[PDB]
Design a protein around this nucleic acid. Structure first.
Ligand SMILES: [Mg+2]
Ligand SMILES: [Mg+2]
Ligand SMILES: [Mg+2]
Ligand SMILES: [Mg+2]
Ligand SMILES: [Mg+2]
Ligand SMILES: [Mg+2]
Ligand SMILES: [Mg+2]
Ligand SMILES: [Zn+2]
Ligand SMILES: [Zn+2]
Lengths: 177, 46, 70, 43, 199, 36, 146, 84
RNA sequence: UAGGGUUUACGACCUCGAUGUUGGAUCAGGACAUCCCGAUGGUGCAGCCGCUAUUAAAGGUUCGUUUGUUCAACGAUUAAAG
RNA sequence: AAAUAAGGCCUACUUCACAAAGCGCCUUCCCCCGUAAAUGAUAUCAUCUCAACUUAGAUACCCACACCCAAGAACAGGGUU
């Protein structure tokens, strides 16, 4: 191993870039993983004074899938300075008018409530489409496993697996459906 | 407050814990039986 | 590729008592040692699961079987 | 053939045990970076 | 289409065929040339000047930019949000003939700033009476807002600098236009004092 | 009306779940359009 | 599955034979689930089992024709509803967003503008209550309310 | 809404579809709509008994059958065709 | 059976080495158990004039004669003087 | 066409004068969830969807010393050919 003092330190205290993807996945687990990677918790030398972190890039933020009926229940409200500015926008409307805000607020609330929150948020980037700048693309390294497993529709199981699955009952031969 | 009240008095923490732990636990059928197996004589005579 | 509760349980289920300070120091300055410890923990977990499933008869886990004392 | 962890990074995994069963032994040889798992230095 | 930047001279009346008084403003289109052009922001843009200001009390960057092109340096530079269709080359003039009668044209400019005014003139408050039984309360603001609230609602009407801000007016019909002097007569008043540039 | 115990005094009445609640519509007697 | 032909002449034809598997696993039962041993080993992701109980246009089938139990029938109905809401049945339509594991409709749930405190918070519904007996494969119970 | 030719006879596979179609709305209740109708039936051997030859006043010639058609569907189709 | 502390009290828990007591003036913030401008169901709905239940608070909510009294009587308004 | 609240002006009318103000004159533009309807099953009737799908269902000001000022308490800003 060896490694001189200054180079070894610069290597062990280096900033790595990661990549995350949505596409039919929940935003809670994605935001939790992003916060865990930004705060440096994933590393064995985690500490606030050390200022250890890693950039997190999320793509396809428009294809996020919520569980239950949160699309018409989660209200992302925010009061302004002037009176009567109590805005109570739902999740669907907030996503239609701004598809890069749900995961942003999730990661903002997940991260600790200290002055490092703004820095950790600035370290994070978001993109609502597959298009990513060349700089960030070249900066990306490795790809951690995805959270959800995707249910897989009927148009992907292939005919082989469909035929392998046996039937379960026998409808009448003269059933009008 | 008095012992008896018109409303439902909030039980103590230990009291509520004992009431919850001493709840009723019905049996658990491993298979459930739901998924297991005069004038007519006069009519016949007529 | 492991969790803290299961790892600690598997480490305790092998007569290998090690405090948290030494574990962290090894994980920081000895990745291979922590990798071997995690492998041993996963092996102990699998052995315990197999035992609980089949009640042994008669392997009793090659890594299990604590050393008795007197 | 059994492997508790994938031996494809850092080092391999080989848990051993002594005849007396009182001390555990291991053998974690470092893994070498293959030749086809790199890129040419651009210029 | 591209707009103009005229000078608000004064005001004069104008009677219609129906026999009714209608106030009309004066707008002198002086030079009015295009400076540059920029494509995609949200839409195309175009810069336009106005009066001819002396090129001695200006920044070196502005002097170089105006030397790269013809004409002398102008006073103001208002950017208009134009579409990709109409695209005029810089350095072209725009006289009063750009507009025609029977058309509604909007105007925006500063206003006769009254400086840090009080309360009545700034918002139209009724103040307090003269007697029964005021002693030192005639133009001051009484209560702020509630009592328990130990704060002050942002945006609350309070003494401030009235006027001296850009304000646009919508719905202003044009009556007559002049080609020789390049004057535009717009209906109704126009924000800004006399001899003031207006967009 | 805001009726919790949706009744059916008429024969043509019928219960139907609509708009996150139950309703009681009737053609011959539309005097039962209750609400929850 | 027979169909009614029309052209005015209106005829009918018989097609698509059932043909069940030869040897079931657990014979001597009632519902097909009890015969195949899946009372608590199935979800909404395995659409292969759900497609065998949905009309060609997305509708549902009666219980007397399928033979399932009341509880099992309601569970299958809820699973089919969840699958249809998740868009896992594009070839079963009547003639923007992504959802899954839902219980209410998108045009019915009102926005929760006021949520009570911790001791009275109006939690959001997730999953369904008729799927509690499913195998947990873990230690934390099914959190059907967030 | 003219004469209809419904038939049934123990010859082919006995299906009570045409029987139920003849014993239903065709009774005296709905018969009050058309007085000069007089729906009649037969019992001839031929095959495919459900030969309900509904003759419309406009000249549509509606037929319904039969070997694989229930009674509720046939009645609903007849009602929809009569309602135009 | 559920919600109210807006009226009358009820208890005196820090505030009698001080919290200055009602109306009336400028300014109004908020809640709807909504008077009116928007949309519906029924009706003892032939139409307006009416009544009832739900949503909508973005806006409006008069001029005067008396009694110190918010309240308390009266003259004329607008769709309304909550 | 009139008022309400907001954004402007002295050329006609007044307080008045090298100004400012109104009694005097110009302008003010987007639907709001509460209902009524195709097509069918659990519930082969019927049926608006807390089952699948269709109907009335952002536009605007902006981002190059020293004298006078319609800009301003200073500061700051505009003009000084
Ligand atoms: Mg006054
Ligand atoms: Mg005085
Ligand atoms: Mg006391
Ligand atoms: Mg006191
Ligand atoms: Mg005292
Ligand atoms: Mg004191
Ligand atoms: Mg209301
Ligand atoms: Zn009825
Ligand atoms: Zn069953």
């Amino acid at each position: 191993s060896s490694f001189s003092r200054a180079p070894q330190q610069w290597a062990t205290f280096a900033r790595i870039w990661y990549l995350l993807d949505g596409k039919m996945q929940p935003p809670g687990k994605l935001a939790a993983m992003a916060s865990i990677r930004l705060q440096g918790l994933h590393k064995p030398v985690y500490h606030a004074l050390s200022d250890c972190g890693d950039h997190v890039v999320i793509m396809n933020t428009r294809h996020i899938a919520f569980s239950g009926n949160k699309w018409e229940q989660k209200v992302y409200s925010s009061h302004t300075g002037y009176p009567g500015g109590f805005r109570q926008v739902t999740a669907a409307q907030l996503h239609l008018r701004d598809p890069v805000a749900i995961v942003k607020l999730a990661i903002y609330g997940m991260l600790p409530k200290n002055l490092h929150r703004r820095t950790m948020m600035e370290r994070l980037h978001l993109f609502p489409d597959e298009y990513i700048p060349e700089d960030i693309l070249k900066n990306l390294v490795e790809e951690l496993p995805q959270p959800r497993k995707i249910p897989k529709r009927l148009d992907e199981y292939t005919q082989e697996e469909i035929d392998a699955f046996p039937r379960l009952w026998t409808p009448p031969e003269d059933y009008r459906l | 407050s008095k012992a008896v009240t018109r409303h439902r008095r909030v039980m103590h923490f230990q009291r509520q814990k004992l009431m919850a732990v001493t709840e009723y636990i019905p049996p658990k059928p491993a298979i459930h039986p739901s998924c297991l197996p005069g004038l007519i004589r006069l009519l016949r005579r007529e | 590729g492991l969790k803290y509760p299961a790892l600690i349980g598997n480490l305790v289920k092998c007569q290998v008592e090690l405090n948290r300070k030494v574990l962290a120091d090894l994980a920081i300055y000895e990745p291979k040692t922590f990798k071997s410890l995690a492998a041993l923990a996963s092996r102990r977990r699998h052995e315990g699961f197999a035992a609980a499933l089949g009640d042994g008869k008669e392997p009793e886990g090659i890594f299990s079987r604590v050393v008795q004392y007197h | 053939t059994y492997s508790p962890l994938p031996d494809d990074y850092n080092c391999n995994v080989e848990l051993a045990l002594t005849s007396d069963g009182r001390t555990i032994v291991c053998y974690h040889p470092s893994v070498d970076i293959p030749y086809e798992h790199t890129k040419p230095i651009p210029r | 289409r591209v707009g103009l930047i005229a000078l608000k001279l004064g005001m004069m009346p104008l009677w219609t065929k129906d026999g009714q008084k209608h106030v009309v403003t004066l707008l002198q289109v002086q030079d009015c040339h295009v400076l540059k052009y920029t494509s995609k922001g949200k839409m195309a843009t175009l810069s336009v000047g106005g009066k001819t200001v002396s090129r001695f009390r200006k920044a070196t960057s502005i002097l170089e930019f105006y030397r790269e092109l013809g004409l002398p340096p102008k006073q103001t530079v208002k950017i208009f949000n134009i579409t990709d269709n109409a695209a005029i080359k810089p350095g072209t003039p725009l006289y009063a003939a750009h507009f025609r009668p029977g058309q509604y044209v909007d105007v925006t400019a500063k206003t006769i700033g009254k400086g840090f005014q009080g309360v009545m003139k700034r918002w139209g408050f009724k103040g307090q009476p003269a007697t029964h039984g005021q002693t030192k309360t005639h133009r001051r603001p009484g209560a702020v807002a509630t009592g328990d609230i130990g704060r002050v609602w942002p945006g609350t009407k309070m003494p401030g600098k009235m006027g001296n801000i850009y304000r646009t007016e919508y719905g202003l019909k044009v009556w007559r236009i002049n080609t020789k002097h390049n004057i535009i007569y717009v209906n109704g008043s126009v924000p800004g004092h006399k001899n003031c540039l207006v967009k | 009306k805001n009726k919790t115990v949706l009744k059916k005094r008429c024969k043509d009445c019928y219960l139907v779940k609509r708009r996150g609640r139950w309703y009681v519509y009737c053609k011959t007697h539309p005097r039962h359009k209750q609400r929850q | 599955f027979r169909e009614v032909v029309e052209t005015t002449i209106i005829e009918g034809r018989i097609t698509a034979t059932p043909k069940e598997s030869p040897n079931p696993p657990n014979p001597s039962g009632q519902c097909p689930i009890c015969r195949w041993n899946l009372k608590h080993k199935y979800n909404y992701d395995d659409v292969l089992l759900l497609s065998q109980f949905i009309r060609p246009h997305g509708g549902m089938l009666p219980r007397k024709i399928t033979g399932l139990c009341q509880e099992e029938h309601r569970k299958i109905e809820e699973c089919v509803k969840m699958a249809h809401r998740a868009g896992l049945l594009p070839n079963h339509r009547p003639r923007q967003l992504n959802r899954y594991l839902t219980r209410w409709a998108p045009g019915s749930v009102k926005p929760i503008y006021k949520k009570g405190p911790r001791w009275n918070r109006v939690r959001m519904p997730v999953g369904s209550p008729l799927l509690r007996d499913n195998v947990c494969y873990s230690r934390t119970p099914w959190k059907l309310y967030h | 809404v003219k004469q209809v030719r419904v038939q049934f006879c123990p010859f082919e596979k006995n299906v009570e579809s045409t029987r139920t179609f003849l014993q239903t709305v065709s009774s005296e209740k709905v018969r009050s709509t058309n007085l000069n109708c007089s729906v009649i039936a037969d019992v001839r051997h031929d095959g495919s008994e459900p030969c309900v030859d509904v003759l419309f006043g406009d000249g549509h010639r509606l037929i319904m059958r039969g070997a694989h058609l229930t009674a509720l569907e046939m009645l609903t189709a007849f009602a929809s065709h009569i309602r135009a």
